[PDB]
């Protein structure tokens, strides 16, 4: 659980943004203590009007591509895994399904040559993903189980680094912002992303004091 | 304690005439 | 006249029943051995 | 023997599914909504609640639409992250069942409902009306 | 802070079966044949 | 205002909620934060009936011969013991039938209603019933869920103890309550454990 | 202090200016209409009243549309020609003013209003709605 | 929160004005302690008659122009985002809508080529802004939703550095002046502005004691 | 049944000659009563069907 005390904007005490080390697969928690900045601004503390943005400063674009399927409840779904690894050079394809990042409400069995079968658990409808690994390179295969009635929408193909939808919080008694920082299992080690935070305090009458900071997320394996 | 069975006597009737 | 004048001139007879329809279950707390105790961790 | 229940609790349309309407609540002292769906919903829908003020050009026409603040009682823990009251029809409300609710504190002369962003294509399958209570004047 | 309140307009019935023990069988009869 | 007295309703709907939670806990409560109930601790000796071959399929079953052998087996050196069970099970026993069609209990009465306190059965229909509520169990085929619970029996006055430290209490929580809103706070403190668990027994399928 | 009066006098839509909606009146035992105008009318506007029956196939969907008969009460001298209930919103009724009528004898389980023929031109400026009184579940 | 104690003009105690660092997008607060200057002038303390002025000593004029539009309530608004960036050379244009500075009462569907559509929030009447960025050049686009009758005025296109209309206050009991100093998201790093403060005291009888000071705002990136 | 279904008693029948409409050649009587009931709480009852 990282902890950053932000600069106080007082004209007083290498790179710009602070650092955050993250390992592919983890889902960690972060704390930020705006006390030094918002306590002198005697108002109503912070507000839940914070916004986050994630930009990449180094990507090393992925090798394998992802894929999306469709199926109804109870009906077995079949699919291949060979049209997803565009190999510029010739090599063998050691297909493997990581037992850690398998499906959540189903089960898959890996074929010998780019084959797999996702038989969903009985009486289950929703969206289920599982992360394959073609020759060390990692991707995802997302399938939706429809309640046989009409159809389901399209899920957004989770990014390498994300901040979850609604898990932020703030305690105006101690001026602390808490949020979650999650890393996809496909984030490539060595890369670096940048996270920006716009947090807005408030005076006694409802106006706004804005404050912006940044953080450098470096995807490194082994912690 | 391990689950022990509760075998009770079956339909016991006869001792002198085997069935054909 | 009547049947076309609001619904406030007619005061219903508030009868005194209160339907419940809720089984608790069945009590099973008098078979067990009872022991009054004192400060916890006896 | 049913009464002309119209007077003494009248009712008006507040959201016909395609456009909102401001309803005057000055003449009365207590009011509430009655949600009702016409077809099965796809996800939780959220409506914003708005209160108007008498326009300066004419005191019998609503002015601009301000948004009513939010009041917690004691049990409130969610606080809707905005301090601006809003309703949320939960998923799995079959279209033969109504849901009632109202704001704890009125302000202004008018009240209005409109679908919050994100749930604007499901609100086309719902109906929201307002029924008041005793008339002050 | 709206707190909703919902009732259904038409309740539905609810049927169920009434399975009862079968005429027993007894495990193993003495006078018998293989 | 609000002619219907709400406070006395909540004080009534709190002793009631507490009453059934306590009764539910001492049975199947799991260790942490709730007393270890005697259903889940599972150190009572457990007996399980053996199946029957309905035209060579071996469905699980439970017939009156099993009930008599289960209750008379209790070693009378432990004392007098009472049996507890779900009322559907007692309905299950009462509706049995011999091969020719007669009833095994009350050979023609339209009803078998015996003195229970002269039979030490103490029906309490919250326990788990193997009839899946009803509409299961007692079939030719496709019912009765092997491995289920049926009934128990023990010298309860010494096979399971109940511990009470401080009964239910209510009090106005001064602080958090203002001149316009009251905050009440209620609580109680109790627990339970098993005595010697060679005094009980359990019947399964 | 306003009461959540959606339960205990709910209200539903019956004519939004383009479509009638059957409102189930079985669960309750008193009901009435509260007309309302959205823009000045052109002439007298007449509405027919309809009551439905539980459908033959499904018992919680309305059947066909049957026209409810009308009854007098010791002073009816108009006595509508074919003895069928109807309501006439009088001309020169402004907005911000609501009229409230109700059929005396209830029958069926769904009631509905429809714009009588020859008056569906300026009937798009009215918005009828219903409010029931007291659950009997 | 900045804090400057002002010189009391007693003939006693690099550049002239004090130093204020600022970050593009922030909105901070400043305190000034006029105590040392007005306390000897025993009178009725300070009076809320302070006047501000902002001048630019280094501007680097903006590359991309700003713009303005209009629409009625509930009606969607669409417009172009390409005729606002006259480019001197010939190159490509990577339009972007900064998430931290998106709209506040609607959404914008930024098309692929300088096109966008602005759907105003339901039942909303007022002004609404969002800050685009063409090739890194930032400029604001103002949209005013009218309440379907006639019109609203044309807002004044907020400056790079501004002090808000009325968020100031003077504590005559401790001779301290406070105000808010907000920096547009269109400020260009490195630029320097100058804020001169004219504060007026008052004697027991009703005359004036004027006092003038200056400050040098330096728009720096990363605080 | 004492708490599954309720019967409401208000007034027994009456009988009186309708004066208006009964001439000195005809005669017309008139009667009616007023009562009702409802279903209290249908969780205290069962039904055995085939």
Author numbering:
A (entry chain U3), H (entry chain V3): 1 to 13, 21 to 230
B (entry chain f7): 10 to 29
C (entry chain h7): 166 to 207
D (entry chain m5), G (entry chain l5): 1 to 137
E (entry chain g): 1 to 34
F (entry chain h7): 260 to 464
I (entry chain g7): 415 to 464
What did the study's authors say about this model?
Caudovirales, the taxonomic order for the tailed double-stranded DNA bacteriophages, is characterized by the presence of a tail—a host cell attachment organelle that is connected to the genome-containing spherical or elongated capsid via a neck. We describe cryo-EM structures of the neck, the neck-capsid and neck-tail junctions, and capsid of the Agrobacterium phage Milano. The tail to capsid junction involves a symmetry mismatch that is bridged by the neck, and is therefore crucial for the assembly of tailed phage. The extensive network of disulfide bonds within and between neck, collar, capsid and tail provides an exceptional structural stability to Milano.
The peripheral ring of neck 1 breaks the C12 symmetry of the core and connects the neck to the capsid. Five out of 12 gp14 β-sandwich domains (n, n + 2, n + 5, n + 7, n + 10, CCW direction looking from the capsid side) display pseudo-5-fold symmetry. The head joining loops of the remaining seven gp14 protomers are not resolved in our maps and thus likely to be disordered.
